[PDB]
Design a binder for these strands. Structure first.
Ligand SMILES: Nc1ncnc2c1ncn2[C@@H]1O[C@H](CSCC[C@H](N)C(=O)O)[C@@H](O)[C@H]1O
Ligand SMILES: Nc1ncnc2c1ncn2[C@@H]1O[C@H](CSCC[C@H](N)C(=O)O)[C@@H](O)[C@H]1O
Ligand SMILES: [Mg+2]
Ligand SMILES: [Mg+2]
Ligand SMILES: [Mg+2]
Ligand SMILES: [Mg+2]
Ligand SMILES: [Mg+2]
Ligand SMILES: [Mg+2]
Lengths: 239, 455, 448, 239
RNA sequence: GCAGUGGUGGCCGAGUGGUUAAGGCGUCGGACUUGAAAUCCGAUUCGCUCUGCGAGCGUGGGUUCGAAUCCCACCCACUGCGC
RNA sequence: GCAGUGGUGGCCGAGUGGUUAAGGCGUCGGACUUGAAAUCCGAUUCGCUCUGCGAGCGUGGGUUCGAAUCCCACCCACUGCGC
């Protein structure tokens, strides 16, 4: 049935290694820059807005919004050293606007690099699906302490019954809505209820949490397919 | 053979399960313990040998670079060797050589020992196998078809002579003990059986294949067993010397047909209807009704052979399909039989399960095995290196195909069954499914032309 | 083997005819003189041995009757038993010497006799070069048309041949035959067996190996080293794989007295043949044309040795083969083989050579031979059931002819029936083919 | 075609041996006494009639006619010693009425045992067919000198196209109307013209020479067959 | 593969240390009978210099003056085992 | 069986004593792109304690610090012979 229970332990203990070898084999050429960020969230629209990018990758999510709006300071978090080195070697990088640092969002703590209750917006774009479902609230609590008590957290990631979930063969299933790719990285497909009751258990307040529907079409192969991402915004209670 | 990683416990293996299986087959356990210790030592020896090879390679690379830059004259590192004259690196290479040679000897010994321990270990058992060692008591009868209690006058030993289709004495003069001439109406009947079986299997989707009868020793070792290859196979010798062995079944050359190949998963269920003459050296007579043409040295056999996907329980569905094909064959021939599940102690090393079709001989009053259907899983494909996909994955290990075989029709034994089951007082009635393939005049009855040798 | 009375002028024979025949066969003619001298000395030795045995038996009878070398019956009747024992010792020494001489003479006498070929039929072309003097006796069909592919490509285009994997499994020339070509070979066997069964032949499936003591009597020394595989059992038996089913069929009646009434014995041998010599002579001889293992259907006839019936049966056998190949639509010519290329047993041989339009050559498909009593007297297969007093026995005549070697006939069918879309099925094999293969064998691969 | 010319020479030189071995293997049991003799010929009917029996066999032709008529003296001629010994050991034999002697009728001469021009009747009953066709006139001349100049010679033997001539296989033929039996003895089948011109060439005179027709019938096998013997009487010219 | 009994002529079958290998059965030819035959007479392993002598009883050897008869080996059957 | 030339990865095909076994072709999966793809990114012999190191160029050996490159043997092809 599911993947061997021994193998799932090897996947959990080698999560950072699997993401590091991904950046080794694929360099910065796999993912593409996300220019839809500023438009999608009512924040990030056009003073000194300090931001934390949890799971920054090689950029692709902060460099666009950072060359767009020129009064944003950014913290960058990633547990893979290769991704950090790629972010630093980017020609668009300057220390006066970015502060990149490695931090395993489940084991390490964010206060060792960012000041408490300082960040006004933190982004979770396709980062939480790579974390084991039983260590996600660890990440939510780790980022709960650096958020300004009126600030918020922005989240887009896979949703239930997306096509990518569809495609996976049965030999790639770790559990309910929990799969693994050929390269070792994993994918959890969230539901609105699961994410809601995962954010509520760590002290957040739901604002918007609803699915976003798209489609993928390759004209040459004439392939058009449905896609289901879950977008949301949670807010830290004022008082 | 089994996968060596089933014994490595540092990998996801478990030798305790191999011990349980080796007990259920009533074979010798402790071979699992010898295997586990040999394997655990071989893993460390492999690590050390890789490291010594890396050091030797790095010494050679450094020497080449020193020489091409025209130089003036084992905790080693890359930079560490970069600070030595060529003579000193060669002095180091000599120590590397000595260590590599002794490690290589130890590793070759450990590999051979682990493999000779893995050789005996039988395949894993399907949970449907009856655990036992008494074949006469625990053979599990599964199904019965027809009337398996009727009695008739003559046994096949008389019937083959009353139709004048058998020459035993002259055959033994020509070939020796058990040699025989088949003649007259029984040559036509054998050919009719071959035509009918080939046509049936071809309509089911099998590819008829006529195999060579001489297999080379290098290839026969990979498809046969120690005991068979020792005392059961004839050896052929030409001019020179001669490493050839007459095949005991067509399953042996057909297994070596896709030897050392990467088979596409699409088209994986390859089905072959082998047709050849088989040469078996063991012919022991347990009474009169096992003489005649029942146990002979040479006979034609039609075999089923299937290469299958190792996933999704597909080889076991294929196993059921093959036994069903043989069952329907003998039901269209109108021969009663029962299906028996063989006990653990009687399976050979490759089989995970074996079914037998045992036909009722009314003139002998006995059950005699006509069909033998086995599922050997990847035990043989691993030995022959018949891989399941065309591409090897990044990290995963190579997967092998499953290989099943099942006799469709051994001509002499089936002729004996037809003769005993279709005898009347005036001759042998021809089975309705064989009348297409018989000559005119032999399409209704094979008449008795001689008296019974017993009478 | 020839009758030893043909070499004895004392009997109604003479070795001059044997010398002239050894010249016609372009063999050595000095064997006849050695044989005649050995034979003339052996007759004297045999007479002396019989006389010594007679004296010994009279000595024994005298001693036996009394207890209860110019010697005569009455002469011994007047001696003390001790004297008869002394005489018996003298007779024993003489008998020992005479038996040594007689065994030596018989040995040399048989060595020179097993190398003199059969007498020739007056129709045989006397010559030694086969390629010019073989009398093309008759033509059938169109033996000049030419077509695109040879069999070496056609067996691959229909996907019925596996040579590389066969050479991995069995070695040089090993092969798997698969698919449509197995069905075609089986159809050929069925058609040949029914054709021969309608003519009065008895189908016979033979053993594939033979004891050496029996194989010696049907084969020559040249064959054993050059062409016969040896089978080894356990404990190290001495069996040989048969090169043709004529060899076991010949031994089926060894040491028998056949009834003249049932003398026209005809058998249709079916077996697998094993040859070692597979030497190649170009591409058109590769494929399944010259292999180590193939099925063959044979004609074997035991005939009366009287009234020219053997030669009438010879003509009948070659006519049966010819009709088989005319009904298949294979063009051929019949060839009278020259005396130089005859085996020892044959007194005349006719080959049927078929035209191969893709190869552009004639290839031998049938060989018909009349060995008269050469092998019958070596196997002691006797014509009458009763022997006459003071009259030597006659042996039957034995004839063999290939009906169908399946691989070569498949090659000829493929080359003669190829179209652009596949191979047309011969009209006479359609009833023996599976449904779906009764009009055309389709091409499924490209030509190499 | 015909029998080997070498074999025909062996048959001619071994004629006496072949007849002797016949009497050895068959004893006196093969042929049966001829009681039809006295009736068939007008001679031999009921003074002192001296007779010569050429080819006497073991009797079977003179003992019947000799126990019938008691005033007949008989000379007996045969080249086989066994036949002579059987004739002598016959209990019906007495020297006062018979004079048996061996004489090869072709090589030997009759005057060495019988007086010239003395015999008044000589019988040739199935004797001339055993003689080679080129040595028959030898026998006729050998017996011409012992016949009284008014006496005669009585002859019965096989004729042309008799059944026995038919039965014989082609491998038993020595020449035109000339065959050999399994035992080596031969059979010549005479024609009226041949016998006439054979007796005329030696000084005889024909009286009667005509065929006699019988048959043979075995009821159990239902076999009835024609038989053609040639009977004749030749007479020595008076003056 | 052992550990017992066996092996006769075209076939059956006697055979007892001095056969003519009996008796049958089958097959094959010869028949000249007047008293023909609803049968009779024979032959029927190999060899030789052939009216005789020699060899041959699964095949080879031994003992004996002499073996088809007694001994041994091998081969092949049948009866019990191993497999 | 001799007396010549040859043998590279799934296939073709480079290869020059210091490769990363080039380039293709085939196959296989991954794709998160709002500037989606009439495509892109990769992988694709064996082994080990796996971000690397080791082995592998018909198979075995030799020379060299170092061989896919040079040498030898064997095997198998092709070209000429013997047969
Ligand atoms: N538990 C964890 N702690 C810190 N980073 C993590 C993490 N789990 C996964 N990641 C990082 O999250 C990244 C997801 S790839 C997505 C990158 C980014 N969201 C973008 O839009 O480009 C990976 O590079 C991985 O390194
Ligand atoms: N040339 C010859 N001279 C003498 N006798 C001869 C002979 N040729 C044949 N015979 C004898 O003639 C005999 C013929 S058998 C006939 C015997 C006699 N006629 C009868 O009626 O019984 C044979 O016995 C043979 O010995
Ligand atoms: Mg007998
Ligand atoms: Mg007898
Ligand atoms: Mg003996
Ligand atoms: Mg290649
Ligand atoms: Mg490449
Ligand atoms: Mg190599």
């Amino acid at each position: 049935t599911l993947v061997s229970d021994f193998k799932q332990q090897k996947l959990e203990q080698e999560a950072q290694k699997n993401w590091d070898l991904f950046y080794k084999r694929n360099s910065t050429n796999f993912f593409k820059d996300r220019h839809w960020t500023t438009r999608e969230f009512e924040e990030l629209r056009s003073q000194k807005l300090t931001m934390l990018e949890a799971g920054c990758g090689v950029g692709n999510c902060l460099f666009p919004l950072l060359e767009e709006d020129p009064n944003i300071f950014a913290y960058a978090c990633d547990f893979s050293p290769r991704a950090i080195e790629y972010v630093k070697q980017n020609p668009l990088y300057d220390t006066e606007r970015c502060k990149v640092f490695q931090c395993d969002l489940t084991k390490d703590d964010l206060l060792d690099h960012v000041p408490p209750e300082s960040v006004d917006v933190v982004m979770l774009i396709f980062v939480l699906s790579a974390v084991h479902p039983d260590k996600m609230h660890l990440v939510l609590q780790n980022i709960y302490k650096v958020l300004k008590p009126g600030k918020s957290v922005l989240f887009r990631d896979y949703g239930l019954y997306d096509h990518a979930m569809l495609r996976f063969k049965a030999s790639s299933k770790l559990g309910e809505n929990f799969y693994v790719r050929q390269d070792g990285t994993r994918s959890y497909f969230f539901t609105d209820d699961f994410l809601a009751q995962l954010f509520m258990d760590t002290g957040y307040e739901e604002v918007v949490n609803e699915y976003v529907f798209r489609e993928t079409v390759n004209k040459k192969e004439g392939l058009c397919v449905p896609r289901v991402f879950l977008q949301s915004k949670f807010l830290k209670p004022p008082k | 053979v089994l996968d060596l990683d089933l014994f490595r416990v540092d990998k996801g293996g478990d030798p305790a399960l191999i011990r349980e299986t080796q007990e259920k087959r009533f074979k010798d356990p402790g071979l699992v313990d010898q295997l586990v210790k040999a394997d655990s030592e071989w893993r460390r020896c492999r690590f050390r040998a890789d490291n010594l090879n890396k050091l030797k390679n790095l010494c050679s690379k450094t020497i080449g670079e020193k020489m091409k830059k025209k130089e003036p004259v084992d905790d080693l590192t890359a930079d560490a060797l970069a600070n030595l004259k060529v003579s000193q690196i060669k002095k180091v290479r000599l120590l590397i050589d000595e260590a590599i040679l002794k490690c290589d000897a130890e590793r070759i010994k450990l590999e051979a020992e682990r493999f000779e321990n893995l050789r005996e270990i039988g395949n894993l058992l399907h949970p449907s196998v009856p655990i036992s060692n008494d074949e006469d008591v625990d053979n599990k009868v599964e199904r019965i078809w027809g009337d398996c209690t009727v009695r008739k006058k003559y046994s096949h030993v008389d019937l083959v002579v009353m139709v004048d289709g058998f020459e035993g004495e002259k055959g033994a003069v020509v070939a020796g003990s058990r040699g025989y001439f088949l003649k007259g109406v029984l040559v036509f009947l054998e050919q009719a059986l071959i035509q009918y079986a080939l046509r049936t299997l071809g309509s089911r989707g099998y590819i008829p294949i006529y195999t060579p009868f001489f297999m080379r020793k290098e290839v026969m070792q990979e498809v046969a067993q120690l005991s068979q290859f020792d005392e059961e196979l004839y050896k052929v010798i030409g001019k020179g010397s001669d490493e050839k062995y007459l095949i005991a079944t067509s399953e042996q050359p057909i297994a070596a047909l896709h030897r050392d190949e990467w088979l596409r998963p699409e088209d994986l269920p390859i089905k072959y209807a082998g047709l050849s003459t088989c040469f078996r050296q063991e012919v022991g007579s347990h009474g009169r009704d096992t003489r005649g043409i029942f146990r002979v040295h040479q006979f034609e056999k039609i075999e089923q052979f299937v290469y299958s996907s190792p996933h999704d329980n597909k080889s076991w569905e294929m196993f059921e399909e093959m036994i069903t094909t043989a069952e329907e064959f003998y039901q269209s021939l109108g021969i009663p039989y029962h299906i028996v599940n063989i006990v653990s102690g009687s399976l050979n090393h490759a089989a995970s399960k074996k079914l037998d079709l045992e036909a009722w001989f009314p003139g002998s009053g006995a059950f005699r095995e006509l069909v033998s259907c086995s599922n050997c899983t990847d035990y043989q494909a691993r030995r022959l290196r018949i891989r399941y996909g065309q591409t090897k994955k990044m990290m995963d290990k190579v997967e092998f195909v499953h290989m099943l075989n099942a006799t469709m029709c051994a001509t002499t034994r089936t002729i004996c069954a037809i003769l005993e089951n279709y005898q009347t007082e005036k001759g042998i009635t021809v089975p309705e499914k064989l009348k297409e393939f018989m000559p005119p005049g032999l399409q209704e009855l094979i008449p008795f032309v001689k008296p019974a040798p017993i009478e």
